[PDB]
Every structure is written in C-alpha cells, then in structure tokens.
From Swiss-Prot:
Effect of residue 95 to S: In alphaGFP/cycle 3 GFP; improves folding at 37 degrees Celsius, reduces aggregation at high concentrations, and increases the diffusibility of the protein inside cells
Posttranslational modification: Contains a chromophore consisting of modified amino acid residues. Maturation of the chromophore requires nothing other than molecular oxygen.
Single biological process term from Gene Ontology: generation of precursor metabolites and energy
Organism: Aequorea victoria (Water jellyfish)
Tissues showing expression: Photocytes.
Outcome recorded upon mutating residue 194 to I: In mut2.1; shifts fluorescence lifetime from 3.03 to 2.50 ns
Biotech relevance: Green fluorescent protein has been engineered to produce a vast number of variously colored mutants, fusion proteins, and biosensors. Further generation of mutants led to more stable proteins (at 37 degrees Celsius for example) with brighter fluorescence and longer fluorescence lifetimes.
Record annotation: effect of changing residue 65 to L: In RSGFP4; increases fluorescence and shifts the major exitation peak to 489-490 nm
Gene3D superfamilies assigned: Green fluorescent protein
Phenotype upon changing residue 172 to A: In mut2.1; shifts fluorescence lifetime from 3.03 to 2.50 ns
InterPro entries found in the cross-reference section: GFP, GFP-related, Green_fluorescent_prot
Effect of residue 145 to K: Increases fluorescence at warmer temperatures such as 37 degrees Celsius. In Esmerald; leads to brighter fluorescence. In VisGreen; leads to brighter fluorescence
Protein's UniProt name: Green fluorescent protein
C-alpha cells in the first residue's frame, strides 16, 4: 500500500474545527501525534473562541482513523491509510437520542509530514435544557465497536456505530453515528470486507491550562477477521 508506509513511525497531527450548534459558533484547534503501529493517538484540543458551547466528549469522534492499528493479516482492508497522502473526505450525521444532531464534513490528508483533519460541524434541533446544551455529560469516554463496510458506488466506505455518553445522573446519552468516507485523490484505494474497529479513550485536563480544553489518549485496533 502506498499510504501504509507513511504511518510506520510517529506522525504529527493537527485538527482544526469550525462549528455552529443551535447558533452557538465556536472553533477548536488541536495538536498531537499518532503512532499507528500501536494504534495510538495523543492530542490536546483548545477552544480558541472562548468556552466550548457543547460538552467536550461530544466532539471526540469528530476530532483520523488512519491511525488505527490494522493487524498484518488485515492490512488489505485498511481504506484509511490507502487513501493517503491525498486523503479522504469524512462525512457524518450524529443523532443524539431525544435531542439534536451534528452533521460534519471533514478532509483528512497530509500537509507536508503532518496529518491534518479539517472539519466543519453544524448542529441543529438541540434542546436548550438537554444533555448537550445543558452540559450534563460526564467528562469521560467509553469503549466502542466501529463497523465498516465497503461502498463500491463511491469507491469508499460506509461506517456505523453507537457512542454511549455517560450522563451525570448515572444514565446514558446515545449518539448514533452514520458515516461515509470517499477518497480525495483519483488513485486506487483498499475497499474492505466487513470488519470493525475496537476503540478506547481517556480524557484528562492539563493542570496548567486555563483555556477551555481537552487532553485525549486513544487506542484503536481493527478486528473481526481472522
């Protein structure tokens, strides 16, 4: 694979997002690094416009699956790395159960030796007193399975999964994710057999950071094929 070789070592990552949720406009800049050999991501995000109007956990999935660890026997199913360096467009609709939805469009590609994720996010129909605008979500994150299938019609993939956000009262706020990825370049990509990604994430704070921010440590491994 052409793109596979670009991930054998530690790669710097930049994430830039502009969002608008129910009229609340904000921007976030993130920096870190990824080491696909171990399916590892380490990043720090800062809301550059002031206070983030939604809970940080709700943006984790929007903030580079090319850093997932694909076992050697599954390398032929790694669409994400195969689209590099030209990259791919990643689009999602995230439905927050009994609340609003986010629609995102992102471009993930290399700029020099840096992997960049540029995102535009639009959120609508959120309840002012719901778990999102009411900031009722715990500052933590669960482990999930991300299901991937080929989309030959677009020379890309379709992805679906359910994120579980813990609510402060002990309940759970479901966020159903529907996703599509299509290559930016015209080169060939790896269309995969059905499989999934096993994820885990830990959220923390930089004790010396006074700006609204999130520190993220994440591990992801592809599975479902033996």
């Amino acid at each position: 694979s052409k793109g596979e070789e670009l991930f054998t070592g530690v790669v710097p990552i930049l994430v830039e997002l502009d969002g608008d949720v129910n009229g609340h406009k904000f921007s976030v800049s993130g920096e870190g690094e990824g080491d696909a050999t171990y399916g590892k991501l380490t990043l720090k995000f800062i809301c550059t416009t002031g206070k983030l109007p939604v809970p940080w956990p709700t943006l984790v999935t929007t903030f580079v699956q090319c850093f997932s660890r694909y076992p050697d026997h599954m390398k032929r199913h790694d669409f994400f790395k195969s689209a590099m360096p030209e990259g791919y467009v990643q689009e999602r609709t995230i439905f927050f159960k009994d609340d609003g939805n986010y629609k995102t469009r992102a471009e993930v590609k290399f700029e020099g030796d840096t992997l960049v994720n540029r995102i535009e996010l639009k959120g609508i129909d959120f309840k002012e007193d719901g778990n999102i605008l009411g900031h009722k979500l715990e500052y933590n994150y669960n482990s999930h399975n991300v299901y991937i299938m080929a989309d030959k019609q677009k020379n890309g993939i379709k992805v679906n999964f359910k994120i579980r956000h813990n609510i402060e009262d002990g309940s759970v706020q479901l966020a159903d994710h529907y996703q599509q990825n299509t290559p930016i370049g015209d080169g060939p990509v790896l269309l995969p057999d059905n499989h999934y990604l096993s994820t885990q994430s830990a959220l923390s704070k930089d004790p010396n950071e006074k700006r609204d921010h999130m520190v993220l440590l994440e591990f992801v491994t592809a599975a479902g094929i033996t």
